[PDB]
Amino acid sequence: IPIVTSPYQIHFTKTPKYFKPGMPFDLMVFVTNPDGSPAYRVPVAVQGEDTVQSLTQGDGVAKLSINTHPSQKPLSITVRTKKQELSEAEQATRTMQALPYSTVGNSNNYLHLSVLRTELRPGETLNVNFLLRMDRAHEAKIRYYTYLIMNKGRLLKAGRQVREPGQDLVVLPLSITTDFIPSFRLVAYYTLIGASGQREVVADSVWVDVKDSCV
Amino acid sequence: SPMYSIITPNILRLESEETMVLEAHDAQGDVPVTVTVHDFPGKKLVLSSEKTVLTPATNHMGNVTFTIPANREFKSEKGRNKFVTVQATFGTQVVEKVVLVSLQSGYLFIQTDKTIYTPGSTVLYRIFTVNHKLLPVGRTVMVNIENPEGIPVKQDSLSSQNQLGVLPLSWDIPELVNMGQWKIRAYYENSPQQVFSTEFEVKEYVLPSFEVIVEPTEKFYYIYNEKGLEVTITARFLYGKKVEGTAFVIFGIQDGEQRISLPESLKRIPIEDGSGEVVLSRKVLLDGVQNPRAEDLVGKSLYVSATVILHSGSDMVQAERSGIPIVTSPYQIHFTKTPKYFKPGMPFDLMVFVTNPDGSPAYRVPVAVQGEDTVQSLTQGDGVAKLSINTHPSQKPLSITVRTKKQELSEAEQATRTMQALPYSTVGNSNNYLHLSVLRTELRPGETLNVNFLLRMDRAHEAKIRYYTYLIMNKGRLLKAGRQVREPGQDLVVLPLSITTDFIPSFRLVAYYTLIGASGQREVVADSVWVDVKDSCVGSLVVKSGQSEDRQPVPGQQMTLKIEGDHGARVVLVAVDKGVFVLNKKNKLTQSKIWDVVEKADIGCTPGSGKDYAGVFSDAGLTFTSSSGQQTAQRAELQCPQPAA
Amino acid sequence: LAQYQKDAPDHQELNLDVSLQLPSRSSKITHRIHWESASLLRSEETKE
Amino acid sequence: SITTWEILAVSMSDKKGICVADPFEVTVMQDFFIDLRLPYSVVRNEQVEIRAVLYNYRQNQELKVRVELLHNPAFCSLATTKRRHQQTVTIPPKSSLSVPYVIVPLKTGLQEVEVKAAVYHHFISDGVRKSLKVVPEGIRMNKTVAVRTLDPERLGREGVQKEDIPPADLSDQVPDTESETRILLQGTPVAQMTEDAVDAERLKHLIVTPSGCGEQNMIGMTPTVIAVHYLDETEQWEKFGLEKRQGALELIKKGYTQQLAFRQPSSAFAAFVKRAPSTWLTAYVVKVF
Ligand SMILES: *[C@@H]1O[C@H](CO)[C@@H](O[C@@H]2O[C@H](CO)[C@@H](O)[C@H](O)[C@H]2NC(C)=O)[C@H](O)[C@H]1NC(C)=O
Ligand SMILES: *[C@@H]1O[C@H](CO)[C@@H](O[C@@H]2O[C@H](CO)[C@@H](O)[C@H](O)[C@H]2NC(C)=O)[C@H](O)[C@H]1NC(C)=O
Ligand SMILES: *[C@@H]1O[C@H](CO)[C@@H](O[C@@H]2O[C@H](CO)[C@@H](O)[C@H](O)[C@H]2NC(C)=O)[C@H](O)[C@H]1NC(C)=O
């Protein structure tokens, strides 16, 4: 039975440590009870502005997101609970610092992945969003993304998602089956020849969790 | 010069709070704004209150409120449309817009102790008086009781002020009475044209001691089923024990409002272990009708009438199941939750509503787009499936067809639906769009919702878009509005939105940006989407037993009734024998039917999007007007334009 | 044409004052029939 | 009453609004009991059968029951004060048994019937006392006395009308039974006497901007002023356009502004301030204003 000052314990273990400068960044905050059990419906907030809050989901994860500026400087991240009636001294907090994504030669050509955060059950569909970020002089050369699915130490699924000029954001419906249990990573990349005739490869990845059940 | 803007709903209501949103775009320094409401036509002046200052610190924002009164002068015209025009003064530049007025003032719900009564007995009834916000209001209500042919026999007039919006009343039925359907009709004093009603039955009856349930295996009939319609009989006493007896069951066909009976479909089965089963074969059906075509049977409906008597011979109950459709498909697909306007050159979301033939939502049926078999999705719990396409910059309408892919079922059994979407028209065909994308789940209060804003324009003007302007429409009024700032290079921004009890049952999110583009021309681009919220109470009222043991109490015994609920609320109770509902369970009021009436009073007519920025707001239920000249389309009808169907 | 409308002529001129003399005769039931009550139903019940 | 009660509760909160709770069910029951199932009504002085149902829900025990119909001064049967009408029956376990009785109603009204039963070797008993309506022979009739038209201007002459309603003769009325006289009045809705108005299709052209001299300003102001007044009384702004009245208000207000520039210092009007004042034009503006 722990002896602590705060009825909660916040962890960035499930939070990505690298943000995209000038691009929105998602924060997956893992809030737990002192023993290690997930906390339910505790409102945590970003250090900047008390208005940006969110209540923890059923699995002990809270969803927050920021809109990063094109700053190449690391971004300080601090999350703090705002549970009512409890004093500020009782509110848990955790602090980390994220690092910026580095493009090929700092060309400022990025790929951004964004995915829904909910208790995912096999048999439902998931919309994967692919966002291209680059100067539009080279946007016509990106006609597709190439994605792969890693699950349980092996490649489960892979394919192409076509893209037309001017459509920086594309949506790919993905059906979740029992094979994606317990968790999987989605990697994606595009390629082109830019600058003065030089090969450029930009990549991105994201980790997804699946709800506990039998195959 | 900066552009001033006023945002108000399409239709304003009497005797209710009306949100007024004032904004200035690209403004510099402070600007005082005075508010005034005039009558229309003519000038008599109905309200002169309220003023505010749009501040660069507040991003030139300011929300103010007003309330439209009701007197003998307002309540004069009852049958035709009348309007009032609010004028807004931004410093010295005045902006004004004519607005539609609704003569409705709130809601009326009527509860009775029973659904069916005896001559010479007492009728107890309570009326809950709430405004459009479902909060207790104190107003004078006019109630009338009419006979089967519509003759008012008893009428009341009373104020619920200081009674917390509850009017408990009573009335005695004489023995000299015409049995049949009797209706209670009520309307507020300041809104005589908005009439509410609920019905009850008068009969010479005695309550039975057991219930009869007629359960079809499927709530529909597939024509080419060789076995025919299977209907399971279930019967039990009112206290929960199994019934032993013999049943006589008969079938029939319902065509429109006229019912045809099949005499030879009669069967006689004993009821054993509190249950029975009877099957109407396909051959008997074809023999019952004189039409040998099975195609003509599609679209008609069946009904079942059962007569059950105990093996003691002392009681008898008649039960009925009706409206069982005769269809080719066990499902019905609808684009009702899908927007009818797509963005050329941008991905578009499809919200497909698949239902069972009766009208109930279907669960976990896999539907797919007709074009390309790879895109499939299973329906969620509320009968909605998520599909999406990658649109080409085609200015030609795009045909969308969805077809279910449920296994084992034949292609003839697969439901399908076909529609054609329309392209969004930009200002001068500038091809500068706004795209909204939002998660699709059963939204419960206490969760956060991430709204995604995607900007589309040439990067020569992307630095000029420094903010978005968003508003939330819920239950015919503006609930929340604000700005979301944007820095250069951030075409996509995310805004977490927290869902509270106020967003029930559904809300629309509109958003827009503005700038001076093309060759020096003001441009306004808008987008919208309609979101559903899970049906539930605003608070939480729970009734349970205080005792934890001594199952099945004894008649007359004292027991403890435990009621858990929000602090400060007033609770009304009624305990009825379930036998009355076995005789008549119609007109039973519930929370879901309350949210059903609210949705039927919504002024929004489209699940978002639109032909242009003006159609976005006009379809959502908003009026927009600026100092520059851009304004919403004129609307003079309270109702929503009817689909072609 | 505006003066034709505005106070547009109409067929209603209802101004009926109707009263009843009851067998009990404790009071005389009296009602008025105007335009707003043109098609209004008035009903009364005696127990004899 | 032995049944499952459905308890409906609705809450009223000034902050959380109205809420209809889920119906709550309370199942009241007794292991052994009787159910006397009467008809809603019975005809006076005619023998009828009543059905009393006795329930035994033991899983392995059949019960020997003494069931008795008690004496009644309003009903005739074998039950008298000296002689009771009692039977001894046996009910198998998990079953029900009905014991019929024969009675005769003797007097009208909501009269009382009572039955009792007790089992041997267990001290478990039940009794049912219910009332049912004893109705004399006959049936309802809703005959009409008279239907007539009221017209004081036409009937009675000189704005006054008087008329009687004779009582119904109804020689077939059952003695000492209620009889209501239902009086209904309904006025005669008279409409029409209105001719069609101009549909405002081709009237959209009368929006003219005032300009020119004083009389020329009145020429441009003339059609715009009367048009808004015509559309107001015809309430045809739905077809014409609600936004166009606000635009016409600016032009009419603008015409009133330009008209005062040609006003003579003696409150007279002419084409110019140099021109002699026009008596006709002065009267025309008064008619317009
Ligand atoms: C890799 O190749 C295999 C070939 O075995 C692919 O599996 C087939 O996928 C198609 C999808 O159209 C199915 O219809 C076939 O039934 C599959 N093959 C078998 C043997 O079942 C697979 O899709 C390819 N890609 C990946 C990522 O595995
Ligand atoms: C006598 O009373 C009856 C009601 O008991 C009335 O007639 C009813 O009229 C309705 C139409 O509005 C029918 O649906 C019912 O079936 C009628 N009932 C009958 C015929 O018993 C009416 O007030 C009187 N009718 C007669 C025939 O005397
Ligand atoms: C409109 O203005 C009202 C001012 O009365 C705002 O209400 C206040 O909002 C702030 C921040 O949300 C709260 O801290 C205050 O407590 C609110 N006032 C009261 C009396 O409680 C309202 O939020 C504004 N709405 C919009 C959409 O701008």
Residue numbers in the entry:
A (entry chain G): 324 to 538
B (entry chain A): 1 to 645
C (entry chain B): 1257 to 1304
D (entry chain B): 776 to 1064
Authors' description from the paper:
The point of convergence is the cleavage of the 186 kDa complement component 3 (C3) generating the C3b fragment (178 kDa) which becomes covalently associated with the activator surface.
We present here the C3bBbSCIN-FPc structure, and as we previously suggested the major FP binding site is located within C3b residues Glu1634-Phe1659 encompassing the small α2 helix and following large C-terminal α3 helix in the C345c domain of C3b. For the FPc-C3bBb-SCIN complex we observed weak electron densities for FP TSR2 and TSR3 and for this reason we did not model them. Since we do not observe TSR3 in the C3bBbSCIN-FPc complex (see below), we suggest that a hinge is located at the TSR2-TSR3 junction as well. These C3bBb elements are recognized by the concave face of FP TSR5 including the “thumb” loop together with the TSR6 “index finger” loop. Direct FP-Bb interactions appear to be limited but the strictly conserved FP Arg329 side chain may form contacts with the main chain of Bb Leu349 while the Bb side chain Tyr317 appears to reach out toward Met420 and Glu422 in the TSR6 index finger. Since the coordination of the Mg2+ ion in the Bb metal ion dependent adhesion site (MIDAS) by the C-terminus carboxylate from C3b is crucial for the C3b-Bb interaction, FP mediated stabilization of the AP C3 convertase may be explained by the observation that the three C-terminal residues of C3b Cys1661-Asn1663 are sandwiched between the FP TSR5 thumb loop and Bb.
